[PDB]
Amino acid sequence: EKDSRRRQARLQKELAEAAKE
Amino acid sequence: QLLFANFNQDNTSLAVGSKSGYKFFSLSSVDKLEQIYECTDTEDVCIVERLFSSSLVAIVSLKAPRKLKVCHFKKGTEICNYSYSNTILAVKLNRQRLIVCLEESLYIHNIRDMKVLHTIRETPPNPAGLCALSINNDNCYLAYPGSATIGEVQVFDTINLRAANMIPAHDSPLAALAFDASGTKLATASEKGTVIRVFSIPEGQKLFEFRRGVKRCVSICSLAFSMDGMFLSASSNTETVHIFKLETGRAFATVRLPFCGHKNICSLATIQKIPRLLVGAADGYLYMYNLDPQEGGECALMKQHRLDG
């Protein structure tokens, strides 16, 4: 529904941000 | 109060889960157990797995034992969650993969987007959640029991998503598993607890065989390598921890705990230039012992700290 598009984008950004060492 | 205590992948952080939440402690000094984080918004936390010293943590609560939560703990945000068909027994992670262990199956997630990349189905029953995951990106292996009645280890490549080997490690079922920091050595123990073996990974050649002074049988609950791979500690439901030195059969050093029977977790960490054995015990204390890497022998107690802060 392309709402998956921005949520997946936010997901990947948030996981990368959290994993930053 | 306390339900869980464990060390992160490079022994820089101690996690303590309790009925009211969880805490992280740094492990960079000896005089005090320095709290670096406390959470009180999640009750009955039974698994807390940090990714090195990053802000990413995987949490499981007894309120929802089939649900994994991935959070940014400093910001206090839930990033995403995932629910499985049965209770989560263990969670392991490294910079590329997150592994969830159920009794009968294993889930391999990409930690960059939390997608399931592979599901290992119908494993031999693993009620203890026994598994190990390499912290090294180039040798990114998962180890788990290949049998519930024999001590066979399945070795699985979590990058290429393929089996690499099956190692007949012990005659009795496995009790403990640990990778060294390079991911090229795997330490193993069985329910008899009389022999600790080390195998090369993925080749499966037996490299070391250590005897815990023989005697009677113990329930080994923790194996841990030092970061340089030279030392391997083995603790159990008894008062003795054995430390083996991987030089070209018996313990190089020992520590005598002040209790007999509590479950505990050990790690070998260098703190302020001195190698130490850290023991997190179910009696609610963290014990710190000094290891002499040249002489060995019995290790003296340096500090003991309350796990509750």
Residue numbers in the entry:
A (entry chain B): 210 to 230
B (entry chain A): 14 to 261, 299 to 359
What do the authors of the reporting publication say about this deposited model?
The ATG12–5–16L1 complex is responsible for conjugating members of the ubiquitin-like ATG8 protein family to phosphatidylethanolamine in the growing autophagosomal membrane, known as the phagophore. PROPPINs bind to PI(3)P and PI(3,5)P2 headgroups through a conserved FRRG motif and bind tightly, but reversibly, to membranes using a hydrophobic loop in blade six that inserts into the membrane.
Here, we report the crystal structure of WIPI2d:ATG16L1 (207–230) complex at a 1.85 Å resolution. In order to generate a crystallizable form of WIPI2d, the flexible hydrophobic loop in blade six and the putatively disordered C-terminal region were deleted. The ATG16L1 W2IR nestles between blades 2 and 3 of WIPI2d, burying ~550 Å2 of solvent-accessible surface area. Hydrophobic side chains of Leu 64, Phe 65, Leu 69, Val 83, Ile 92, Cys 93, Ile 124, and Met 127 on WIPI2d contribute to the hydrophobic surface of the groove. The acidic side chains of Glu 226 and Glu 230 of ATG16L1 interact with the electropositive patch on WIPI2.
